[PDB]
Design a protein around this ligand. Sequence first.
Ligand code: ANP
Ligand code: ANP
Ligand code: MG
Ligand code: MG
Lengths: 331, 343
Amino acid sequence: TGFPLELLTRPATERLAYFENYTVAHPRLKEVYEILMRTIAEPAGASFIFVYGASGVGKTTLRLRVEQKLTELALPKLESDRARVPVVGIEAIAPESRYFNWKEYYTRALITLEEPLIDHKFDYGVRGISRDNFGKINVESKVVAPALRRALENALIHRHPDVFFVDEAQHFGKVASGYKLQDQLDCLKSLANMTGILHCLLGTYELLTFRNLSGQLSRRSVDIHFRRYCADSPEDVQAFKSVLLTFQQHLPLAETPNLVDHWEYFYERTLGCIGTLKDWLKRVLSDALDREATTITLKDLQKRALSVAQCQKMFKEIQEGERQLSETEAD
Amino acid sequence: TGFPLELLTRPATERLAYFENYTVAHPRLKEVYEILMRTIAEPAGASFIFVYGASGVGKTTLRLRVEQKLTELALPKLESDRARVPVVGIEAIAPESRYFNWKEYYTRALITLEEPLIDHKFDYGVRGISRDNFGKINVESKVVAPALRRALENALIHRHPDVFFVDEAQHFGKVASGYKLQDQLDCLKSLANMTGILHCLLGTYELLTFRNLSGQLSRRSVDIHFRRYCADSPEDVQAFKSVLLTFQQHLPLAETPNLVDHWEYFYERTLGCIGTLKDWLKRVLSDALDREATTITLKDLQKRALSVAQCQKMFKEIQEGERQLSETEADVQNLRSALGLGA
DNA sequence: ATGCATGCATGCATGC
DNA sequence: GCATGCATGCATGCAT
Ligand SMILES: Nc1ncnc2c1ncn2[C@@H]1O[C@H](COP(=O)(O)OP(=O)(O)NP(=O)(O)O)[C@@H](O)[C@H]1O
Ligand SMILES: Nc1ncnc2c1ncn2[C@@H]1O[C@H](COP(=O)(O)OP(=O)(O)NP(=O)(O)O)[C@@H](O)[C@H]1O
Ligand SMILES: [Mg+2]
Ligand SMILES: [Mg+2]
């Protein structure tokens, strides 16, 4: 059906905002979203759900779509119990020091599950941790790590989120030493087990080595490979062409540019990633709107495209990750 | 058009000040400035803008120009959006320790986001961060780094600056171990992604070690090469001739000396970085004004030029930078062939 | 006036 | 041995 035609009478800002809000439900995304939703609907005794994808494949967008859907689902049940929390999600902070700071992570976890109805669980065993003089929670600096962890466990078991999201969980990987890496993921696992809360990890292929330090991790968790569209298969090429056609039909410009015929050039840079493709089209459309142009030329794509040096490194990284996603059976 | 002739009646300080304030809009600076402007106007999820080039090329001047232009643009809307700070800029501190110190960086970042009017941002952090009844937002020493970072992010998301400027970005390369370099920029990437604030990083080619730290970071970054003029192409030589003619016209003196004739020497001891040429000309003009001479001689230019060893070292660094920064259609075809059929 | 909350002063393990 | 950060120790202030 394309974009609404009346947007052409609107200023450039409105049209640009429209494009950003508009979403493409591509089939790989639908598959991954459905799988993740179904796995959320039934833990099956697995403490972790790992969603690893090539950068730009839609990971964070997927995570967001999941929170919206679960909030829509949980609002009717939230009617009854105000205290219960639907979903908690936060990005893992990359540490500036040698290793991951779990203390700051616990503080930000407590901040994330902050509830306006604080009167339900105003005391987690706190040394002045609860909010005061401001809406935001004021965690006491001198509180030791185990006490903060206990308070976080109490808050989790009180609110009981359906699933706990860690955005860009590749950061957990940073650690001071090769042998000390074994402890982080297992500590997170212990926290998940005691709380009983389903934890989900989203990140790049960097966590793949962090993923399978032993077979126990594979046994106790579920893998969701957010695969990109691969030019090797004509199926993925056709899907990519369909996505390009949808973007051509939905970008707010007077004349729809023929993006489809330049699919090879788009793949060259995007590498089958829809998010990178969407970002590139947003760049080009913003350029055109600021020029008040009428159509998109290949020069427009070239001007805001990623440098071929960037694409080379990106392709090497994703190809290495995909090859790593080939562990064989012990049979 | 030349300098205002009335300046000749003014003292030497005014004559020098006019030339110091004088600016040249040479084409490559305009191209880079336009690209940076357009990228800032649309972050498009990109987390980093890497602007790098040789020493003396115009990068800091660009940082000041974009700051002023964005402030001017946002002022009419700043008349309604009081809490906003359009552009904030800070210079990375070269650390005395073997590794960069993030604590001082965060403290100076908060200091950079300062408004004598406390009303716009009444609360900045947990404790030990509020101002001491003065405009300066002094930070208590015992405040640990993670809480400091949290306060910085809470201040940033409230002020919501369009772009965060980190000048002289090469100091981020100071680290104790090799692959810890990934983690050094990963921290800033996490800050940018959490705060939703686009970071522009400016520095020399020493920062090229950051260029492909990771595929994620490669996607998140945009490269803007501040090209210095290369004598191998007659186009750059023509542009350099135009710049030299403009400087010859605009320097205040009794007569305009023929700087154009000595373009070979100027390129020899400037490597085509117009900032160094401007600075050298300012030095020579200052010498002339101190002598109150009517004209610039080649001897004056020689008296305060750069040493041949310095020029050789600069060229040796620039050659490595450009070699790292080169791309050919053969590389594109090689990439395409790996992907599938290549055209 | 007596226990408790907090802020500053040692202190130590780390880090080198 | 200096430099660094967290932790606690001591001490004072508070307030009921
Ligand atoms: N299928 C999609 N439909 C609509 N918007 C999308 C889609 N995929 C990506 N986007 C847009 O792209 C951005 C999020 O892309 P995202 O999935 O986070 O890429 P990403 O690689 O996961 N981010 P990161 O991994 O940290 O570099 C948002 O602006 C989304 O609107
Ligand atoms: N385009 C320009 N127009 C006018 N003056 C310029 C220009 N570029 C540089 N300059 C002059 O060069 C000096 C600043 O150059 P600058 O951009 O700071 O070089 P720089 O390499 O960034 N300094 P640094 O990086 O610390 O070595 C000032 O004296 C400016 O007047
Ligand atoms: Mg993402
Ligand atoms: Mg400079």
